[PDB]
């Protein structure tokens, strides 16, 4: 009943990383208050408004910095757009929008360097429509300018978030290794660049800013993963979903941010639809799977598992997409294996999933069968995306017929 539903809602959200939660701790408190106080309609109204916010949330990112800093390349890398493609930022004194190719409501803006302009910091922000943005990225390939520190100070005074991004770190490291092959120390180079930049910036700021050292040519390396985590941490909870969807699927961490965001969203949808007192029946599973077809194709698109995206990795292993797909779990996820019935496997899965946030004592909270099928597909899709990152190596060491880990609780 109500008290079991509130405690299982709290237990569900406790399982996620702090920077991944798509609702605030106050949203959680308010939903639990209404459920515990027998105000179930008020609880469902909060959840509906949260889902509307999450689903309609725009994301506008301002990227500012001088010419030669790798700003175009950064804007393209963030969007997953190749340098030669249509929509690519080309590789000069108004702001330019670059829409995300795959997500309507996400725009990366190219702002000209304040140093290109004769404006004060305050007036530069008015001119560039500062109110439109979720945060600012201040990019340099060198050291920063007093110019950048003053702009950051102005942004902080408007109560908004900025991040100093130092590009081309891979080029500086390569040059030093070639210069000093016997005494090269990567960590010393990184510390010396970060320290120079933060020490000069702080001369005009409240406290020591973090500087993120990145390579625009590999978003997996250096401080780029730390930057993605900080950007999530600092966003409003409701904007973390669209930002997670905007990330590449090029690291296990980014795949897991997408997996976690989507699992939270489909749980909220399940709450909105309503808790059930008994395990849902499997009589109509093919009809429920057919109703989810568009959804499962969307999930494939998010994880890079659509047929078009599989072509690149398959030629890479020098095999056909079809041969690669034999070794992935998502195609045959809802197929009978070892003559175990799909309904019996789902009944077992539901008992585990509902035991994880319910435990052995209190009334069990069940949801509609569609919730469990979505949850299962998302875990499978993510585990298939992780395996694609290391396919060559996984393929050699045949750890069974699939290269991916099984989705939690499905196999027995
Ligand atoms: N190795 C490496 N090359 C980079 C990086 N960022 C940009 N580049 C390359 O820099 C070259 C062009 O230099 P820039 O003009 O500074 O690059 P951009 O992205 O066009 O720069 P902006 O003038 O700031 O828009 C291109 O070949 C980019 O691929 C980086 O982090 N590492």
Q: For the chain, how many residues are written?
A: 412
To which H or E segment does residue 140 belong? strand 135-140
- Record the tokens describing residue 293, joined without a space: 């077809």
Identify the residue whose C-alpha is closest to ligand 1 atom 26. Answer: 91
Q: How far is the CA of 47 from the centre of ligand 1 (A)?
A: 44
Pocket of ligand 1 (CB under 6 A): 67-73, 91, 167-168, 170-171, 215-217
- Cross-strand pairs, 294: none
> Is residue 216 annotated as involved in ligand binding?
yes
- Cross-strand pairs, 211: 164
| Nearest residue to 309 (alpha-carbon basis) of 392, 385, 396, 403 | 385
Contact yes or no for 3/38 (Cβ under 8 A): no
Q: How far is the CA of 267 from the centre of ligand 1 (A)?
A: 42
Name the DSSP class of 363.
P
Residue 65, helix vs strand vs coil: strand
Identify the residue whose C-alpha is closest to ligand 1 atom 19. Answer: 70
Residue 400, helix vs strand vs coil: coil
Contact yes or no for 165/214 (Cβ under 8 A): yes
Please name the method used to determine this structure: X-ray
- Cross-strand pairs, 138: 64, 164
Contact yes or no for 241/57 (Cβ under 8 A): yes
CA–CA distance, 44 with 12 (Å, rounded to integer): 17
- Cross-strand pairs, 135: 61
> Is residue 194 annotated as involved in ligand binding?
no
Resolution in A: 1.5
What backbone phi and psi angles, to 5 degrees, belong to 85?
-70, 160
Place of tokens 């959840």: 47
Residue 63, helix vs strand vs coil: strand
DSSP string, 230-270: HHHHHS-GGGHHHHHHHS-SSSHHHHHHHHHHHHHHHHHHH
Q: Determine how many CB atoms are found less than 10 A away from the CB of residue 132.
A: 13
Atom of ligand 1 nearest to the CA of 68: 16
Residue 103, helix vs strand vs coil: coil
């Amino acid at each position: 009943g109500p008290m079991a539903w509130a405690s299982s809602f709290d237990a569900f959200f406790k399982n996620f990383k702090r920077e991944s939660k798509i609702i605030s701790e106050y949203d959680i408190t308010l939903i639990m208050t209404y459920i515990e106080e027998n105000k179930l309609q008020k609880a469902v109204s909060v959840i509906e408004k949260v889902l509307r916010d999450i689903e309609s949330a725009p994301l506008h990112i301002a990227v500012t910095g001088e010419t030669g800093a790798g700003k175009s390349t950064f804007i393209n890398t963030l969007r997953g757009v190749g340098h030669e493609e249509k929509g690519a930022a080309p590789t000069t004194m108004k702001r330019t929008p670059y829409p995300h190719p795959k997500l309507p409501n996400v725009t990366i803006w190219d702002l000209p360097g304040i140093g290109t302009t004769n404006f004060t910091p305050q007036n530069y922000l008015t001119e560039m429509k500062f109110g439109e943005y979720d945060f600012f990225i201040i990019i340099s390939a060198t050291r920063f300018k007093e110019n950048d520190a003053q702009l950051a100070k102005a942004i902080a005074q408007m109560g908004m978030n900025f991040y100093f991004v130092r590009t081309k770190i891979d080029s500086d490291l390569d040059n030093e290794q070639k210069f000093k092959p016997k005494s090269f120390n990567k960590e010393e180079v990184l510390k010396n660049i970060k320290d120079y930049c933060s020490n000069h910036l702080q001369e005009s700021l409240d406290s020591e800013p973090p500087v993120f050292l990145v390579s625009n040519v590999d978003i997996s390396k250096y401080d780029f993963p730390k930057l993605e985590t900080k950007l999530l941490q600092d966003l409003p909870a409701h904007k973390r979903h669209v930002f997670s969807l905007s990330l590449q699927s090029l690291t296990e961490a980014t795949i897991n941010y997408k997996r976690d965001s989507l699992k939270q969203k489909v749980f909220l949808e399940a709450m909105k639809a309503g808790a059930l007192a008994t395990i849902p029946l499997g009589g109509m599973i093919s009809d429920i799977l057919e109703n989810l077809d568009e959804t499962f194709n969307l999930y494939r698109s998010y994880f890079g598992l659509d047929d078009a995206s599989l072509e690149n990795i398959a030629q890479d292993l020098n095999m056909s997409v079809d041969d690669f797909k034999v070794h992935l779990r998502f195609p045959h996820l809802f197929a009978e294996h070892n003559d175990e019935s799909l309904e019996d496997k789902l009944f077992k899965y539901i008992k585990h999933i509902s035991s994880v946030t319910g435990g052995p004592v209190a009334a069990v909270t069940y949801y509609r069968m569609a919730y469990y099928l979505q949850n299962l597909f998302l875990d499978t899709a993510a585990n298939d995306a992780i395996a694609l990152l290391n396919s060559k190596a996984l393929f050699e060491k045949k750890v069974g017929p699939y290269i991916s880990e099984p989705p939690e609780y499905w196999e027995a």
